[PDB]
Amino acid sequence: ISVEKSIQEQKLNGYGVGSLIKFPVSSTAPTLDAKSFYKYFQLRDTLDDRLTAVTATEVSLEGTTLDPTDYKVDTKGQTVTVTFTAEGLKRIKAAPGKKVSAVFQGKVTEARNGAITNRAQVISDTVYAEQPPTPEEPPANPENPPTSNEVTSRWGDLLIKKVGLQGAQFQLYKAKNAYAGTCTKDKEGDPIAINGETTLTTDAQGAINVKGLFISDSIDGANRDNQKDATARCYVLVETKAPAGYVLPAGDGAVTPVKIEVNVTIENTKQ
């Protein structure tokens, strides 16, 4: 019995703080003897404290379509469980070699040290019986259960200062050369939502504090908008509105390349 963990392309969920990180978790169902049955089967994941409103979605058994009464998803503190019901356990027994999976998830509140890690576990047990038994509640604290590989999603912060001048407005973009040694003005895509807001406004001190932007993750693979071993990522900052009475520079003048690592001062000239 083994558990595998990955991470969804962060692009699909959003580069900024307040976005979800989604973790696909899967375990290949064992081949049970005819008279061996599950007492229980649970996917468990205690998510990193930087992730809030933690839960699981997309519960699946490969090659099958589950119904809503096949499992129960619950959160206790940071710990999410996907616990298969009696019907679900019968399905899993009938599906040897097939992947049992779910996507664990939480909302990014902030970067902190910048390395958000995750593991998941499979809590299951079987018993020989002449007659198929009713399931049992999985134990709260099993000793050393099968545990996945650890994955890591890396995040950094950004502090912008307009000079402080209140009411200046900015928008953040994905950079074309996201992993350049020297970041460039070249951008693509729509503005990035920071806690649901795509327009950033400097406060009384002329500051915008972006508490998290995605840098890279530990997953390898073609065309993932990623660089596995990267500790810094490029973004493009665009000034959209000058503070009251100030010049908003034309074209490339209002575009700033920013290097986010696991701080930026824009200088203003008055009319």
Residue with the CB atom nearest Zn ion in the bound state: 87
Taking the least distance from each CB to Zn ion, the nearer of 64 and 169 is: 64
> Binding to Zn ion (CB under 5 A): which residues in 32-51?
none
Given the rule CB under 5 A, which of 18-26, 64-72, 123-131, 174-182 is the region that contacts Zn ion? 64-72
By the 8 A CB rule, do 169 and 200 touch? yes
Q: What pairing do the DSSP bridges indicate for beta strands 264-266 and 151-162?
A: parallel
Total chain residues near Zn ion (CB under 5 A): 4
CB 64 within 8 A of CB 95: yes
Q: Which stretch binds Zn ion (CB under 5 A): 7-15, 52-60, 85-93, 126-134?
A: 85-93
Which CB atom, from 94 or from 129, has the smaller least distance to Zn ion? 94
Q: Which is nearer to Zn ion, 70 or 157 (CB)?
A: 70
CB of 86 to Zn ion, least distance (A): 9
User: Token digits for 29?
Assistant: 């169902």
Binding region for Zn ion (CB under 5 A) out of 15-23, 59-67, 102-110, 139-147: 59-67
Q: How far is the CB of 64 from Zn ion (least distance, A)?
A: 10
| Burial class, 31, CB count within 10 angstroms (exposed 0-12 / middle 13-18 / buried 19+) | exposed
Is the CB of 61 or the CB of 213 nearer to Zn ion?
61
Beta-strand ranges (E) seen in the chain are: 4-5, 20-28, 36-46, 51-61, 71-76, 79-84, 99-108, 115-118, 121-128, 151-162, 169-175, 187-188, 200-201, 207-217, 232-241, 255-261, 264-266
91, containing H or E segment:
helix 86-93
For the chain, the farthest-separated pair of C-alpha atoms sits apart, in whole angstroms, at 88
What are the tokens at 264?
Answer: 């930026």
Q: Report how far residue 177's alpha carbon sits from residue 236's, in angstroms, rounded to the nearest whole number.
A: 10
User: Minimum distance from CB of 135 to Zn ion (Å)?
Assistant: 13
Chain residues 202-261 in contact with Zn ion, contact rule CB under 5 A? none
Least Å distance between CB 102 and Zn ion?
16
Shortest distance in whole angstroms from residue 67 CB to Zn ion: 4
- Cα 232 to Cα 59: distance, rounded to the nearest angstrom: 33
Q: Does 67 bind Zn ion (CB under 5 A)?
A: yes
Return binding residues for Zn(2+). Answer: 67, 70, 87
Task: For residue 70, state whether it binds Zn ion (rule: CB under 5 A).
Answer: yes
Could you give the angle at the alpha carbon of 57 between the alpha carbons of 56 and 61, nearest 5°? 110
Structure-token pair, residue 252 = 């490339």
Q: Closest approach of Cβ 87 to Zn ion, in Å?
A: 4
Our CB check for Zn ion shows the closer of 88 and 243 to be: 88
Q: List contacts with Zn ion (CB under 5 A).
A: 67, 69-70, 87
